[PDB]
Amino acid sequence: EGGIDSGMMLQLEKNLVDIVD
Amino acid sequence: EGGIDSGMMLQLEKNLVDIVD
Amino acid sequence: GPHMLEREKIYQWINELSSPETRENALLELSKKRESVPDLAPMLWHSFGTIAALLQEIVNIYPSINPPTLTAHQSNRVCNALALLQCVASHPETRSAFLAAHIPLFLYPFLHTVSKTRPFEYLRLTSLGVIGALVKTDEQEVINFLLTTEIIPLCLRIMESGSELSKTVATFILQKILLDDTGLAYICQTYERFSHVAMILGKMVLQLSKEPSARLLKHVVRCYLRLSDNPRAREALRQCLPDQLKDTTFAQVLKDDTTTKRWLAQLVKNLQE
Amino acid sequence: GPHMLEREKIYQWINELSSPETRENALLELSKKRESVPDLAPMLWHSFGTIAALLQEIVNIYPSINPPTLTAHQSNRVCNALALLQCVASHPETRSAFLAAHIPLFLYPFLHTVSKTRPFEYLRLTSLGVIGALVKTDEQEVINFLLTTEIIPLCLRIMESGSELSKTVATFILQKILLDDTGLAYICQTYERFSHVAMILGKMVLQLSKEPSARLLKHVVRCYLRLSDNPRAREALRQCLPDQLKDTTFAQVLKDDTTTKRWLAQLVKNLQE
């Protein structure tokens, strides 16, 4: 595919949450 | 008297909580 | 067959970032090792042509940003390069050179986009992550550089009309700016600059009355508390503080997090004198 | 009678710090205005002899500290002087000169005291507050200075055998040192340094399982979390993390503070690889 899947999206969210909290 | 009364001890903790948290 | 050690393999991928025929796969592999390789950032920074290759990846998609035509595959690839820049933004050996080269500026066009398609949201969130990791280091020079740029109006636009997750990261960036003494004085130097922050913060509280977000409300309250350290801002907040932060609107939501309650309690106390 | 404005009243008291006959009362009046006068710190710093008079108050009780003969009256007076030094330590216009003059070092004898009497606890807590306010500014120059001094063993002593509130502020100071990149590498470059910190933190968890303290547990977990950003410390914490941090020992109290749960759960995930 080479697109954007739920795993990539969820991993980004966890990255952002760990940054701001 | 010029001592350390119970109010002053309480207000110091208030300062320290504001710093620490 | 030769079995390279892990350090040799990482350097191989780094070397493979130079050539466009191998760069996309190298970006993929290196981005996966971002957490496993603690010295990845100086390995990238001190490699000839490597940083220039990553910036070229960023700029390559500028024509797809306006008008908005960015594909999921283009966002995928460029966000791999962005993840490597976040690694360089947050490392003590490269952070300062990262600022000196003004690298955060290359992400700002991504923060101007408003398209709600998944390629743009993924790009916007990844870009906010780079800036967020940069200000998390609590370095004065980070805030000094950011104050020379348009970061504050960019964050405010996202805080008002972004996704809940984008809002939380934009508010965190504003929060770090305000926590710096220069940043607080900057935003409070003009009443119009302060008024823009307060109006947008006030509207976020109205939304938070409808969408209870604990993580967003925590950073909104923190921005209000730090604003209450500036006298000019402190007098205005006595009148323009939303009523939802004074009654028991968020009471049941805040019963789960005592850290935010103390902030909101210290905020209303700073508005009474 | 003439009604003197507030700025001239403040300057009158500041000038009265220069004479022994009037210094004590001026100390009292100025300390009561500490949070009302936003520019008190540069007013103090740029007044002739004023800082030297505040240091003389501190140094005047060095002979009363060892052996411990400090009276409540002496402690009250010097803590008013320390309260004024605290606002000099936290103001952006004066904090750098405060550091360059090495002022915080004058407080370290007070942190060596072990007397549990009220005059010594009040002095120790007040001194910890000056250092706490100084590190709360999230600046690198502060941590650089502290690393040329013995602040870390002093904090560790207090974390191990101080009062509950003293433990919290000393842990917060250590927390801010760990959050700085240099501080983290300083504590982690030698295994002896890291194990001393880990042993102290490990022992505090046990006491927290007996005498629960929500605020103290928060900063202990934060120190553990930040230590996990160092590779040598993460692999060691995989084996020496207290069992009370892995089961439901603190889950009963943590349900009232969501912030600390996000930290502890994030910490164990880093230890599971």
Residue numbers in the entry:
A (entry chain D), B (entry chain B): 790 to 810
C (entry chain C), D (entry chain A): 13 to 285
From the paper:
However, only the complex containing Hs CAF40 yielded well-diffracting crystals, from which we obtained a structure at 2.15 Å resolution. The amphipathic helix of the CBM peptide lies almost parallel to helices α5, α8 and α11 and it uses residues M798, L801, L805, I808 and V809 on its hydrophobic side to interact with CAF40 residues Y134, L137, G141, G144 and A145 (helix α8) and L177, T180, V181 and F184 (helix α11). Finally, the CBM peptide is fixed by two hydrogen bonds between N804 and the CAF40 residue Q98 (helix α5) and by a hydrogen bond from CAF40 N88 (helix α5) to the carbonyl oxygen of G791. The CAF40 residues R130 and K148 may have additional roles in anchoring the CBM peptide, but they have distinct orientations in the two copies of the complex. Importantly, binding of the CBM does not interfere with NOT1 binding, suggesting that Dm Roquin can interact with CAF40 in the context of the CCR4-NOT complex.
The CCR4-NOT complex consists of several structurally and functionally distinct modules, which assemble around the NOT1 scaffold subunit1. Among these sites, we identify a short linear motif (SLiM) that is necessary and sufficient to mediate direct binding to the CAF40 subunit of the CCR4-NOT complex.
